[PDB]
Design a protein around this nucleic acid. Sequence first.
RNA 1: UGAGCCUUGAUGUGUAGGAUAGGUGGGAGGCUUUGAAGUGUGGACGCCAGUCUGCAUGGAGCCGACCUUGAAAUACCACC
Length: 67
Amino acid sequence: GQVRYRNDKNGIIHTTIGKVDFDADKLKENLEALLVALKKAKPTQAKGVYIKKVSISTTMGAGVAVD
RNA sequence: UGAGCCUUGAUGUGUAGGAUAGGUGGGAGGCUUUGAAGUGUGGACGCCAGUCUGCAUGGAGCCGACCUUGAAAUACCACC
């Protein structure tokens, strides 16, 4: 559907993607969609590396990032 | 004995509140015989009210959005 969020003052944001029933392909497409979304807003004031760690977790799962 | 690093924990009050509300969103139920509340103790922290925990009984109960609260569960889960 639609999702919108505002990053934390500490430079980190958490986002709801959907129900974990979705498969890995859905997770990956949503991840890349939001990645491009935030890379559009990537401003000049943001120097150097931008995507540090997108720690995806769940109600009973650990938080891990991707490339 | 410093400087950090990774990991594990404890640490977080104007007060609108059942209250020592750190951003998060985890989504409405988790934790619990891998043992509950409720009781007799070691506590340090202590915004002297409250957090946590080993020991002994209990070992089946507390916490829900609950009732609010500008900011809600602090059921868990991770991140910071």
